[PDB]
Structure 1
Amino acid sequence: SFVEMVDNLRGKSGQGYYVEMTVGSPPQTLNILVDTGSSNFAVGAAPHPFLHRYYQRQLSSTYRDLRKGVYVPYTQGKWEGELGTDLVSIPHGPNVTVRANIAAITESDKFFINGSNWEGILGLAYAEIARPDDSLEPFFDSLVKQTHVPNLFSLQLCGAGGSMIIGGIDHSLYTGSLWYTPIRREWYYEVIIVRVEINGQDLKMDCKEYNYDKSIVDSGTTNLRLPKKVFEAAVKSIKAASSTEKFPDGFWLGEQLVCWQAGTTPWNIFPVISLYLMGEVTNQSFRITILPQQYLRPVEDVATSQDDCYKFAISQSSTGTVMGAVIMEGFYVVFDRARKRIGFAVSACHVHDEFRTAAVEGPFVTLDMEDCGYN
């Protein structure tokens, strides 16, 4: 039941959102990062300084060794491991147990994060980007094949963890309309952005620039990441709007804190960002609007806690546009694999203050018939 799956996530955008799973027989409990930006299921399987616990294959009588190895390099971080299959369950997810491929991580570099509280990663994207290749069936595909749960899941990520609902839409988790954008290609969850405004002002670029060389929805990474041209235009606009404030050296590079007296953050001087996504009907679109409460990410540190401090959670990308966790936060996001579309709606934990609120609005119509896809 969906009600049983509600509030089954913990974590933050900066260190990720994770769900409890078990592997092996008897079941071994682990916390697992929910990642729509990759397609491998992998768990720590050997001691590591940052791991509270790990998968012990010798203690699972249902483990089968595939006698093959696998290596996954992400944008930052990588691991190597041994492939096998075993029984996998989600205690606070669907009421089923399935046999799935598992990469047992034996070596890693900058993959595990000190204090994150997760020990593995659940790649929910498509087989096309699985390593070593597309013949390694991803977890969700196995789940659907073996249980015939409906082929979709939804994510409600919340800031200061959320819910992952498998098998159908929980209307309790959103208000207003659910708007759908087509999945352009089933590899990453690739989508098309047709227009970008910052505080109502159109960036006026050829819309293919917004999707150079792809745009994806990626719960596994923290920031909104933009292609250089779009990134520079966005920073220009946000800097202009907030000019009454002085920001530290390096703030706009995203790795320097800015702080304000507790409760005095000047939200109003930062603009809203509107991303218009391709609609299901030709040249119609809808927008999701992103507040500074989203793209200024709070950094929790007891040492700085006399004040409220933030990092700038928009980054220049070399891999195309990435709608990461700070973008997904506050929205109910439906990964409707069965109908090859992703839906957005305002969720119960959407960001807002007394003047402005995150929103999902449409339809909008566009005159120019250009295809905004880059490939």
Structure 2
Amino acid sequence: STGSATTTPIDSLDDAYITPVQIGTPAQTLNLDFDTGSSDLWVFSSETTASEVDGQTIYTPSKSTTAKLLSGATWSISYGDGSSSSGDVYTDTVSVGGLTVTGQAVESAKKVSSSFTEDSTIDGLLGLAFSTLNTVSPTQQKTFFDNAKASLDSPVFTADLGYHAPGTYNFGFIDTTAYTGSITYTAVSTKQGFWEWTSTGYAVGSGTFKSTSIDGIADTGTTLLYLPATVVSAYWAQVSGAKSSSSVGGYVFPCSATLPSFTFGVGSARIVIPGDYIDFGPISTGSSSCFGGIQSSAGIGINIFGDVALKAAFVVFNGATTPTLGFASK
């Protein structure tokens, strides 16, 4: 089997991407944030504290003839950005772009933190990291990809995120028309539960490539590119007026600037992030100070190849016995 679904930016800045997901019988379609940095499929629901719902579409398990309460199971998650959610668990039928899993754990939120409430465009998350990170207790549950894997034509999924435009998540096949050149594959460590790999270096604009190992995670659920302070400083030094602002919480730059590209290495291959991808717009409405899309990972504890990086590539998440990651230009 295979599946194919369009993923759409939630706003004009590509702050996140939503992908429609069919849950239950009859289908209830929710727009989920596909997150390769976490491993829970959770949804706003009829069980969510009413005051914490503000425009999201909810899953109502009582209206699904295939929903079954997973007795005694609860979940609770906290994300790198400080947000959180928690609740109980059903199993139900879940379909993405034509690919169906029966008996998928659907984690129904009873509580969500303010940032989820405040974002009316995201109805929940669909985790695509390794199932070892799944928070369901007392019996850990598998991700949608883990449940689908054996049935897929090939045990892979691909992320093709657009810049200011829709893109595609594919399951079970590689669309050879969706990228240019070849796909370069690189080793993955699953020891922390992430799609963790080592970039071979970077360049700023038309500058020379610096060969240096950068360990980080391919994370579709993080907006920006988080890299070591040395790398980030080298990037922003090429932008007149750019500075790290403690009060704003990262590097800012004059909105009048033309940003240089940023290149990262995948083995001997190179992925070029155009400058415009690094502009996240005014820090506050009407400001001429703009927020940068490359920021320091110092204090996160890990480097994160988030959407800013991934959207410059066609990315293969290869879930073979020994997982690998593939990157192609597009």
TM-score, with normalisation over the residues of structure 2? 0.84
**Is residue 334 from structure 1 mapped to residue 316 from structure 2 by the alignment?**
yes
Gap change, CA 1:194 and 1:86, over 3 Å in 2: same
Residue 130 (structure 1) aligns with:
134
The answer (yes or no) to whether the contact 1:253–1:315 under 8 Å persists in 2 is no
Deviation string 1:75-115 (CA, Å, 9 cap, x unpaired) is: 1201011022111112xx13435220111011011451634
Residue 170 (structure 1) aligns with:
175
Give the one of 58, 70, 76 matched to 1:71.
76
291-300 vs 247-256, which moves further: 247-256
Task: Please give the residue correspondences for 1:345-364 in structure 2 after superposition, counting only pairs within 5 Å.
Answer: 345-347=328-330
Q: Which runs of 5+ in 1 are unaligned?
A: 280-284, 348-375
Paired amino acid for 1:216: I
The answer (yes or no) to whether the contact 1:98–1:143 under 8 Å persists in 2 is no
Q: Which runs of 5+ in 2 are unaligned?
A: none
Residue 351 (structure 1) aligns with:
none
The answer (yes or no) to whether the contact 1:50–1:112 under 8 Å persists in 2 is no
Q: How big is the alpha-carbon RMSD for the aligned residues of Structure 1 and Structure 2?
A: 2.9
How far apart are residue 68 of structure 1 and its match? 1.6
Residue 234 (structure 2) aligns with:
237
Gap change, CA 1:315 and 1:332, over 3 Å in 2: same
Large movers: runs of 4+ above 6 Å: none
Measure the CA separation in 2 of the matches of 1:9 and 1:197.
29
The answer (yes or no) to whether the contact 1:153–1:164 under 8 Å persists in 2 is yes
The answer (yes or no) to whether the contact 1:181–1:343 under 8 Å persists in 2 is yes
Residue 216 (structure 1) aligns with:
217
**Is residue 195 from structure 1 mapped to residue 196 from structure 2 by the alignment?**
no
Residue 10 (structure 2) aligns with:
11
Task: Please give the residue correspondences for 1:1-375 in structure 2 after superposition, counting only pairs within 5 Å.
Answer: 5=4, 7-11=6-10, 14-45=14-45, 46=48, 47=50, 48-66=52-70, 67-75=72-80, 76-90=82-96, 93-112=97-116, 114-132=118-136, 135-145=140-150, 147-160=151-164, 161-185=166-190, 187-199=193-205, 200-201=207-208, 207=213, 210-211=214-215, 215-226=216-227, 230-231=228-229, 233-242=230-239, 245-247=240-242, 250=245, 253-254=249-250, 256=252, 258-260=254-256, 265-267=257-259, 270=260, 272-277=261-266, 279=267, 285-298=268-281, 304=286, 310-317=290-297, 318-338=300-320, 340-347=323-330
The answer (yes or no) to whether the contact 1:196–1:273 under 8 Å persists in 2 is yes
Q: What percent of counterpart residues are identical?
A: 24
Measure the CA separation in 2 of the matches of 1:311 and 1:41.
30
The answer (yes or no) to whether the contact 1:143–1:149 under 8 Å persists in 2 is no
Deviation string 1:276-328 (CA, Å, 9 cap, x unpaired) is: 23x4xxxxx33323332222234699x64xx9974201222223110000101
Gap change, CA 1:299 and 1:34, over 3 Å in 2: farther
Measure the CA separation in 2 of the matches of 1:113 and 1:191.
33
> Secondary structure of the residue that 1:176 maps to in structure 2?
coil
How many corresponding residue pairs?
Answer: 315
Measure the CA separation in 2 of the matches of 1:180 and 1:106.
40
Gap change, CA 1:326 and 1:113, over 3 Å in 2: farther
Deviation string 1:173-224 (CA, Å, 9 cap, x unpaired) is: 111121111212262001012333334345576x3xx32xxx1000000111
> Secondary structure of the residue that 1:104 maps to in structure 2?
strand
How far apart are residue 32 of structure 1 and its match? 0.5
Measure the CA separation in 2 of the matches of 1:113 and 1:16.
15
Measure the CA separation in 2 of the matches of 1:308 and 1:7.
34
The answer (yes or no) to whether the contact 1:290–1:327 under 8 Å persists in 2 is yes
Measure the CA separation in 2 of the matches of 1:60 and 1:51.
21
Gap change, CA 1:175 and 1:113, over 3 Å in 2: farther
Larger CA Rg, structure 1 vs 2: 1
Measure the CA separation in 1 of the matches of 2:22 and 2:131.
22
Paired amino acid for 1:287: R
Measure the CA separation in 2 of the matches of 1:40 and 1:88.
13
How far apart are residue 275 of structure 1 and its match? 2.2
Deviation string 1:124-178 (CA, Å, 9 cap, x unpaired) is: 1111211147831111111224x34431111110112210111101112111121
The answer (yes or no) to whether the contact 1:34–1:219 under 8 Å persists in 2 is yes
How far apart are residue 27 of structure 1 and its match? 1.3
> Secondary structure of the residue that 1:177 maps to in structure 2?
coil
Measure the CA separation in 2 of the matches of 1:78 and 1:35.
14
Paired amino acid for 1:331: A
Instruction: Please state which structure has a larger fraction of its residues in helix.
Output: 1
Measure the CA separation in 1 of the matches of 2:202 and 2:235.
13
Measure the CA separation in 2 of the matches of 1:314 and 1:36.
19
How far apart are residue 61 of structure 1 and its match? 2.1
